Write a protein that binds this ligand. Sequence first.
Ligand SMILES: *[C@@H]1O[C@H](CO)[C@@H](O)[C@H](O)[C@H]1NC(C)=O
Ligand SMILES: *[C@@H]1O[C@H](CO)[C@@H](O)[C@H](O)[C@H]1NC(C)=O
Ligand SMILES: *[C@@H]1O[C@H](CO)[C@@H](O)[C@H](O)[C@H]1NC(C)=O
Ligand SMILES: *[C@@H]1O[C@H](CO)[C@@H](O)[C@H](O)[C@H]1NC(C)=O
Ligand SMILES: *[C@@H]1O[C@H](CO)[C@@H](O)[C@H](O)[C@H]1NC(C)=O
Ligand SMILES: *[C@@H]1O[C@H](CO)[C@@H](O)[C@H](O)[C@H]1NC(C)=O
Lengths: 99, 596
Amino acid sequence: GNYNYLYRLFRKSNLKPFERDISTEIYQAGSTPCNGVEGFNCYFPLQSYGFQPTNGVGYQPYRVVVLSFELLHAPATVCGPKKSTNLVKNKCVNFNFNG
Amino acid sequence: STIEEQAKTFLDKFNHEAEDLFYQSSLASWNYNTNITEENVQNMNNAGDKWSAFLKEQSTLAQMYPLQEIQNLTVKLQLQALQQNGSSVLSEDKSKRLNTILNTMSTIYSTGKVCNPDNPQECLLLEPGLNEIMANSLDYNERLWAWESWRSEVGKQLRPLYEEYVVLKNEMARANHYEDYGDYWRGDYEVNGVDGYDYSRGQLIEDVEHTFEEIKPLYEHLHAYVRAKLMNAYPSYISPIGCLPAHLLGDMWGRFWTNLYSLTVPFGQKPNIDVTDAMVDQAWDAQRIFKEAEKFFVSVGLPNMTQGFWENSMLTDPGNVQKAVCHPTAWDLGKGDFRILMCTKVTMDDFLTAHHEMGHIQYDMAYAAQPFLLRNGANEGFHEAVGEIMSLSAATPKHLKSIGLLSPDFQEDNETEINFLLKQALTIVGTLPFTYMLEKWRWMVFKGEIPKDQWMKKWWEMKREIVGVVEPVPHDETYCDPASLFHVSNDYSFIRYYTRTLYQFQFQEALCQAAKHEGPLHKCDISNSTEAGQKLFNMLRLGKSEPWTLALENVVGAKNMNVRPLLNYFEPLFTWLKDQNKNSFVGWSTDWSPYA
Ligand SMILES: *[C@@H]1O[C@H](CO)[C@@H](O)[C@H](O)[C@H]1NC(C)=O
Ligand SMILES: *[C@@H]1O[C@H](CO)[C@@H](O)[C@H](O)[C@H]1NC(C)=O
Ligand SMILES: *[C@@H]1O[C@H](CO)[C@@H](O)[C@H](O)[C@H]1NC(C)=O
Ligand SMILES: *[C@@H]1O[C@H](CO)[C@@H](O)[C@H](O)[C@H]1NC(C)=O
Ligand SMILES: *[C@@H]1O[C@H](CO)[C@@H](O)[C@H](O)[C@H]1NC(C)=O
Ligand SMILES: *[C@@H]1O[C@H](CO)[C@@H](O)[C@H](O)[C@H]1NC(C)=O
């Protein structure tokens, strides 16, 4: 079991989109608080995933990443690889240089 | 600030925790079934105890939440099962007897002994010793000794031990605020909280009895017919006016009548329908037998098996030193992991066994999306019945010709069908009285309204009346042969098999009508019909999330336990038996002649 990946099982309020929360606060079920000692109501949210080679293909840990694209006041972004061609000479040819 | 939300807040955390511990327990148990060593036994005990204790603490944490105001039906079922205190009522001293007594029973029951007293030549375990000495030999004198070799050498010492087991287990009903321990097994079929669909716990006994008066006439003709043919092997030893011996119905307990097919063949001069020689001609192997099963399911419409099964499971027996048991069992490890445990062999039963067993795995993944507590069938009978419906279709001559195992030109005559129908009747109709035979005794003994001295006299007398079996030799009270059975000795609800036959036939007609089949039920097929596939998948995915009573309405539309659509399947076989039994003595009264 690959017990190296954890996750936030519970949270008092829904997370704001694109926010990373790094806190040790424990979930509060009722009104009785916990002073750091685990009990019947502390409910430590953190839990570790268990990944084994025998896990089914549909439940394997998929390595997923997210790429964001938004426009802000900052101009002159960076795009993908612009495609360049081979130049020619002594011919009436349309040319599209950088700008 | 409501009870409904509090229950959900508790179940969700338990679901994540329960599956994590279950997965570790499930994967660990597989190693014990592959390589057994002295250090392996202790390792499994370490993991088992914590897993067993995990549910104990969770049950206490759910006690203070009242169940009288949670309108959500999904959590009511989950909370009811998780709140079973069980053995917590027993004191520390009393709690230690359960493990010790059960453990010594298992090892004692695992000691197979057929060595002749005063003649210790040799004797092996149950499977190599007991099965061969009765399925091949035809000697009455040694068969009688084999009957006493197990009921007088193993069951004799269980009289004082079985006595203490029943008297304390019956007390658990009071500790759980129940009527009797037998009533506990009836809670699965109990339905409550729905207006008009409620099923009373005591209705199960009456319904089972109410469905028995139609089984008896079929059994009366079957018993009359089988005794006539069994008389041939023993011409002058048994009179054809009484009942039949107990030790001539396939198994020692008579559960399966498969072995009687050869002895009572109608016309054995012509070759039987066997394709064993055909398989070796084409060089069939382990991979080819299972792959043909996979393409059978896709034709119906169900999704094919995942890729984490073929390369992750074992098919044949590995090595030579590995003697780990390979009993047919269904494994649902979760997270898309599914395995099959069995020792593959080139035989008719094993080929059917693989098809029969793999059906359970398919049903397991149907309700995977449900929580761990609800990750099960509607009731104990649904799981076994679902895995046998496809077996009937797989054995049809039409399906055999579809793949190509059978010859392209094979006539389907009356003789070619009676033998096939008779084979199913032996393993279906024959075992039906026996399944109700054992449960009725267990229900009354757990109730406690049976004095000690009347156990043996009542057991034999009513056996001769309903079942119709003569005792090979008189037995006194100290004998405890009914407890030697596997399910009863290990505290397993054997009633689930009684509903298996009824459930299988109820769905068989439901699936056949959904398949738009035009012909007799015995010739019905389910393959190449997406309408049947979607109908089945609709109910399988329900699992335990919905009441089992509503599941019946989704296939046949009847809320009650229907009994009519089970004899129609056997109507053909009944017709040819009626005229053949015109002169045979059908209907047996009390008989003392064989052992007067
Ligand atoms: C038993 O086999 C499993 C699986 O190969 C292995 O993990 C385990 O160490 C083995 N145990 C012993 C005692 O050989
Ligand atoms: C119970 O709660 C679950 C939570 O999602 C919901 O899906 C279901 O419909 C509810 N059932 C009833 C009967 O309230
Ligand atoms: C279960 O047993 C415990 C331990 O004695 C007891 O407190 C509880 O009331 C019992 N509950 C039921 C339903 O029997
Ligand atoms: C199972 O079915 C899917 C969908 O048709 C298919 O892509 C896949 O190849 C099948 N599996 C195998 C082993 O062919
Ligand atoms: C089912 O359809 C397949 C399609 O190729 C066919 O080969 C097979 O014979 C059919 N079987 C039945 C029983 O209709
Ligand atoms: C049914 O099969 C038997 C087998 O011998 C035959 O004698 C009989 O004529 C058949 N009946 C019909 C209607 O085909």
